[PDB]
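Reply to thread "Modeling small-molecule complexes from scratch"

Following up on the discussion above, here's a worked example others can learn from. I took a protein sequence and the SMILES for magnesium ion and predicted the complex. Inputs first:
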Amino acid sequence: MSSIQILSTTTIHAPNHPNDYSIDLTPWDLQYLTFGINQKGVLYHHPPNLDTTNQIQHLKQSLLSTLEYFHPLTGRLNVTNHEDNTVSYSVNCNNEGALFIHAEAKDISVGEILESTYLPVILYSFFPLNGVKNYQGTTKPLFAVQVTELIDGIFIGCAINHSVVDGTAFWYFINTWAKISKGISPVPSFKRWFPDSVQPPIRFQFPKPMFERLFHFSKENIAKLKSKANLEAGKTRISSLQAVFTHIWRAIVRSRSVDPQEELKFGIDIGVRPRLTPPRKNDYFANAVVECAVTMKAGELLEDGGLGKGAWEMNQKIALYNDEMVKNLFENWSTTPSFSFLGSNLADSNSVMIGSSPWFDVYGNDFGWGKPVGVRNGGTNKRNWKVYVCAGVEEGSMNLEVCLPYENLEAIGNDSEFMDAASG
Ligand SMILES: [Mg+2]
Ligand SMILES: [Mg+2]
């Protein structure tokens, strides 16, 4: 039986922190107040020859210098009640503190995590601040790192309040922390983007078991799926990612053996950084993401050519999200607030959600002992019928974390059509 023990829990602060100051939140941040905390982690193998002397200490000290540039990670959220029955939220850069947890897991190895068909559930215990919802950030920490020691490696799992960063900002922080630990770079910015049509203090009103399998998509197989989708749909602008999304969508829906006339939903995150008044990079340390939903009937998706039809439907639905579509969602949010909710582990669902991105630099995170051999999103926001996409080790490849009931994943694993362009 895999188990985990906490070796030490300590509070950490940003060094050379100024006086207290506040940061205002956009609806991109506020929409996640009901969501679990954002969680991402990286797995490292320790070959017998590797020298890991002083590792935990160098990881912590390099983390302290990284926090010098990310003051909000040690603050707390600040809710301001309004006599309007409404609320507003800010980030108070407190230097109040973040968590640094040193832990150890027994009877679980790097190799087991890599080779097991289904993720050992103990790995979810590698992430700190589990279960926490993001509105609890007024008193609970906004940031925590857990370094868990395995018999043949370590796992570094982070948790950052999802109303503070999205995944793009999240992996920018990890990238930076790993740069510093290896042996500076431009300075990010937490100042939020506001159109002049909205005054910052935004006010609003408030409110079967899961298995996980990792399916690999080689560079070559992605190009195959991109071609097939464009060919079948008679198009050229169906992206690599849209073709993968539709390929896994077909496998999941096939495994449900549902009715061909069933109305389906496929939810995607739309990075909106290349649509701001001045464009920004992952240097923009905040949320800049909108949720879009692609609709389709099950028979349309599963019929021959449905790879092309589903992908083109994704293509066209995304295309609707230009600068003016996003600007109006932003300003209309106060009026009609939208929130990401968790829900629980349904035995069956017409909706599939996908998150993360293959453009995150997930393997370029050498702390001084090597690049990671694995990447995982945390378990707090994982439910059945959710998928997370990251790049794989191989250049141009992708890995899909697919969270579903055991028998669905088994079916998908036996699906001749799906496994023709996927392994694992
Ligand atoms: Mg836990
Ligand atoms: Mg990449």
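What I'd highlight from this example: The chain has two domains: 3-204, 211-420. Residues 3-204 form a domain with the Chloramphenicol Acetyltransferase fold (CATH 3.30.559.10). Questions welcome below.
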